[PDB]
Amino acid sequence: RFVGLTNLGATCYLASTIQQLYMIPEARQAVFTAKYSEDMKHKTTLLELQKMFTYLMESECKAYNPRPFCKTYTMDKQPLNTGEQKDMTEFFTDLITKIEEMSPELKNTVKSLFGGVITNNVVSLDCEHVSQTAEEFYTVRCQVADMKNIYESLDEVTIKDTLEGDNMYTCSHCGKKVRAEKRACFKKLPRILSFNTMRYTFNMVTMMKEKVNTHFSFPLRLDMTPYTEDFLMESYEYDLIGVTVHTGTADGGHYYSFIRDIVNPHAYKNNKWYLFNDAEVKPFDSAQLASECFGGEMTTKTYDFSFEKTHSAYMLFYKRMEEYKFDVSSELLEWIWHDNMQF
Amino acid sequence: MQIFVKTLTGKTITLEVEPSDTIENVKAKIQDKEGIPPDQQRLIFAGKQLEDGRTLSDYNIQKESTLHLVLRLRG
Ligand SMILES: [Zn+2]
């Protein structure tokens, strides 16, 4: 009843990313109504992104094979390797950056939709000065190890740190390093706020990255008030629409997503959730959000023995709080219509 | 000039760099301080992931600009 995305070999991350973008209606309509130019950058990708987004919506089939998309997708410098496991949040920044760079219409859409501004402020203890600046962001990383929830993380992200010792300030108006307390906080929050629960630590004895599997919860409705520049120094309540789960260890894994249907008003008003796993989309009972995304330990009845959960949320998607008509290229609809007729 | 770095545990550190330093230099200098091998690191300034081979100047990052250290939960 939803259309999935065929795995080309190792495009777990890509399916998770495309489907979440697809399910945010502002961005679906944004990709649809994007006006093709001649010297616009990533023309082939926006073009292939449109066919995919239309096929996802109007096709009668189970899955869209994203190969036409992937054969023209370029990452860093070289073309995309469909056999290379990748970090979902990395591919997410890659694609959001491209879409931003396509047309100034899209850039203003992407920045307003996914972009935010941190203001972090340095104040000197042995001086008379202050240097608060600005930072742009798309995704907010959250500490997971030794944290019980995302409220604890944000409390640490917006903490009052003390620049001292080996990490002294260098007051630019004083040519000397100074005791300073710096703290970040959010000035402009995006409409779609993304978090990156970094579930890994680098082990110093074994020289190796180590995936973090401890319990880490996040609310269904989030209140961002205590981390806004108005509270320190419109609405800040958000609703969880998406979780990107990573299953596996630090050497590699597999991806899948629990996305909320915020389009169909009846599905949205009754909290209907769906599991997007590559070529497979199935309904999802939100009662098991905690089990499937929070981590911790499970028990089973092996034969009783308790292990650590290696499947947990790597990325969260919240929409700010406040029946969609999509305008899609009629030439594309007849494309999908011709194919639909066989099934 | 000195930049800020939010490391893997959220610790803010400082780095004395010159804008004509390349990214691989920064990953080497990051290895010097917080001890993480340069090839496992991604560095995200102001949303744009800095890629190996370009210049710290090519991204227009100056004093008090913050670099973000992450690894790859590469699934
Ligand atoms: Zn001073």
TrEMBL record, chain B:
Domain of life according to the entry: Eukaryota
> Membrane topology for this entry?
Peripheral membrane protein
**Keywords of this entry:** ADP-ribosylation, Cytoplasm, Isopeptide bond, Membrane, Mitochondrion, Mitochondrion outer membrane, Nucleus, Ubl conjugation
Q: Start and end of every Ubiquitin-like domain?
A: 1-75
Q: Which GO terms describe its cellular component?
A: mitochondrial outer membrane; nucleus
Q: From the Swiss-Prot or TrEMBL record, state where the protein is found.
A: Cytoplasm; Mitochondrion outer membrane; Nucleus
Its family?
Belongs to the ubiquitin family.
How is this protein named in the record? Answer: Ubiquitin B
Species whose genome carries this gene: Homo sapiens
Report which gene this protein is encoded by: UBB
Q: Could you say which residues of the full protein are shown?
A: 1 to 75 of 93
